[PDB]
Symmetry: D2
Subunit: 237 residues, 4 copies
């Protein structure tokens, strides 16, 4: 099975599987039932921004999601990723729709990771920044319904030609190169992730959400994980 | 008076004023009596590295000081700098000697600060990296006994021609430009500081230490702040 | 007696002093009479972007000015800055108006400079990025009519309350810290400058232009340098 | 066949195939016979540094190779990479030995690539920095005799237990993710490469050299490319 650590931007409450009775952001550690959540006042049709950060000194994973001229939603959870994830992982974005839909458009995405080992200035680093996505984005592994090129944007889930969002859709984009998330002999290790999105929903309720995730290198979308599973988990356990 | 927030690498225990009975690292918030300290196994004559980090999401200031092939010392303290420091500050390094001495040589120093406001990718940032210090380092404000140029290093305190450290010395180096440490309308704000040092002590005990500090723009060495005061505080209150 | 090296975005042709008969961009080395120019199809009322780059290996100063979905204007000139400028300089933006006007609005400005000396990874660097300008921008030295805060932008020249541009206006913005542009023992040295602007002109012709400049630390606006002198030169020599 | 653009650090002159009669650095565009070379005073047993740069404004590829307290070797060639290389490529380091040998040790390697298309601050970037190489370096594709982990270094060619170099050896290291080297709608595009090496040769003459290269994504070591072919070319044409 895949080892998943994700920060979810959950637009649809599934109170039956542990979701809060309102849209929220949460920290998922190997389960869709977030170890921590915070109320999120999602704004339909508006471009928002998410920022996720973590460092081995504090061993705390935090995220802030906000819209311009609007209060932000913050969520933090104490977790030592050395004990949860493998040394080498892959990072990506995931999204899904179920009975209800919304567009899960990504306008930009950047990530920076640094590892300092026991030596002078000996820091290994990785950084990538996407502001425009091309039709042939070779450095991205697109899974499921995810597609690039539409207006230079990344469409995680299926959107028809007339621009309307489709139900029962799942899609992910993983950066091509494996990321060395930690090392036993590292003094300091940290990562920063930032992405802007546009969740637009024409129907009754928006669903199901977007999630930033870290996984084992060979991770793939679990079969049937549309809807509430965010394309990350095989079941709601 | 000056508003000081510093991370001290205290090599000499002054138990009479609140120091632990062993070398330690500490977080000083407007007073030399650290709000938080951690035992530090200082290694005489060896190059060490210090890393300090802070972000407005967690509102926690942390630091790690280590030597190669050696366990590190970590210290963290929850503090909202918005309520402590002014919006515009100056960052620097400070060091002192008293009856007992040590060299307070800085081999490198880098700093990165970022402020994200309520707007798309609207991030203001400042970054500087010093690996070599020249005889005429115009972007540094040297105070007291601090001098640059000797072997491309920054000597915070007085070191004789023969290379031996002098007692009763104080010196600081502040980066020339004021730093916008925070702003009421910032979504995220963070800073990272890193510096390598070389503390060498020929005499009985090493004293007194090095400190990374953030202060009011016009800060200056208080008179008589050699020894235990680290060139940062006027008294031991 | 300032030593000036600037890249001009000349919106008004003053053929009487050497300007081409059309808007152009040029490389000015101690004189308003560009050593090199290129036709520039300036677009009234549109946000444009300028990029300047230089490296000691090629000893060539290049710039590209473009507007979205439009052809760019490029200008390059072979010049060894070690022979032209002092070791320590200051960098800034300048703008002026005369009988004719235009707004010289700066929306963003970033600069990065690196110096690699004869040592392993021993690089000294400086980087600052401005996407938003505040009312109290302490790390900037505003000269002449330059002001910050207006909609988070940098207005180099005088703009009325209603927004209309004023004639006979000069203004500059220099970054607070001195920049080590070069060093005799440097293997490689390079710098990159990028800024976006908005030149809007209601009157007959736009005038006079914007310029990115490098100067001696203590440089200041020459008396009477409004109009064709761009706030950089004392005369048309 | 592979499309190769490389900067060679040729330690062994093969005059019979066009090599100058002295160690040299060169720019190879699809052939082992450099379009441009420069005399290089290689220092046996000393750590050196190589810096390569390119930008679409000047369309010139330059490189500087130097040793501390020593004069550098510079080589530049005017070439538009849009006409030579495909849009997506892979970057790496290559080295070889033949009848004569040397160690082709890489101590560090960093790369930065940026593409700015027709849009505000819309820049796509990639940056990776390697100061330490681990035994299980997953983000690198090791070809031939290349190995990592030995003292945290990258040994491009075969070296024994006692550290001595082996003859008739070839090896390469390519970064895992494909690099978008160019795009038809990009205003500016640039890349920078830096790496430190240690060429040590116990035998009569050092051979054959190290090279930084850009190639088609699926490139692999040509059959029989040991010796003078630097593991990049199938023949000496
Ligand atoms: O796209 C949203 C949703 O679609 C699919 O589920 C449809 C409905 O399925 C079950 O009926 C319910 O889970 C329902 O959820 C509502 O009712 C629950 C029980 O009353 C309650 O606990 C929930 O909080 C909610 O009010 C679903 O709407 C499927 O794709 C889901 O995975 C997906 O989340
Ligand atoms: O450079 C070290 C120290 O030098 C100067 O003080 C010298 C001594 O001054 C006082 O005697 C004491 O504070 C002493 O400290 C020792 O004794 C204390 C009392 O027994 C004890 O609490 C301390 O922990 C320590 O054992 C000093 O050594 C002066 O410049 C000081 O500022 C400076 O720290
Ligand atoms: O703001 C533009 C301009 O305003 C001020 O000069 C106004 C006029 O001053 C002089 O008459 C001329 O230089 C004139 O320039 C035009 O005519 C010239 C002669 O025919 C010709 O060489 C020029 O190319 C141009 O067509 C100006 O219009 C003063 O502030 C100037 O510095 C400023 O550039
Ligand atoms: O590692 C060096 C070299 O080893 C292998 O070639 C060995 C020799 O092969 C041929 O004899 C020659 O090319 C010789 O080169 C010398 O002599 C040439 C003719 O006089 C002269 O042009 C050359 O400049 C050189 O002095 C080689 O030494 C094989 O692996 C080669 O690929 C490899 O370069
Ligand atoms: Ca849900
Ligand atoms: Ca003390
Ligand atoms: Ca003019
Ligand atoms: Ca050769
Ligand atoms: Mn949830
Ligand atoms: Mn103390
Ligand atoms: Mn002109
Ligand atoms: Mn050659």
């Amino acid at each position: 099975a895949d080892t998943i650590v994700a920060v979810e931007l959950d637009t649809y409450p599934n109170t039956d599987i542990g979701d809060p009775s309102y849209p929220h952001i949460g920290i998922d550690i190997k389960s869709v039932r977030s170890k921590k959540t915070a109320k999120w006042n999602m704004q339909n049709g508006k471009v928002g921004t998410a920022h996720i950060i973590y460092n081995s000194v504090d061993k705390r994973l935090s995220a802030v999601v906000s819209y311009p001229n609007a209060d932000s939603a913050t969520v933090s959870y104490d977790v030592d990723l050395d004990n949860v994830l493998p040394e080498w992982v892959r990072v990506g974005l995931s999204a899904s729709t179920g009975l209800y839909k919304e567009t899960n458009t990504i306008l930009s995405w950047s990530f920076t990771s640094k590892l300092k080992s026991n030596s002078t200035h000996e820091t290994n680093a990785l950084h990538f920044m996407f502001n425009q996505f091309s039709k042939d984005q070779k450095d991205l592994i697109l899974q499921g319904d995810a597609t690039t090129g539409t207006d230079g944007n990344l469409e995680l889930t299926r959107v028809s030609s007339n621009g309307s969002p489709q139900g029962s859709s799942v899609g992910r984009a993983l950066f091509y190169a494996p990321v060395h998330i930690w090392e036993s002999s590292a003094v300091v290790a940290s990562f920063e992730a930032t992405f802007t999105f546009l969740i637009k929903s024409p129907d009754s309720h928006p669903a199901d959400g977007i999630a930033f995730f870290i996984s084992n290198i060979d991770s793939s979308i679990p079969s049937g994980s549309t809807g509430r599973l965010l394309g990350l988990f095989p079941d709601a356990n």
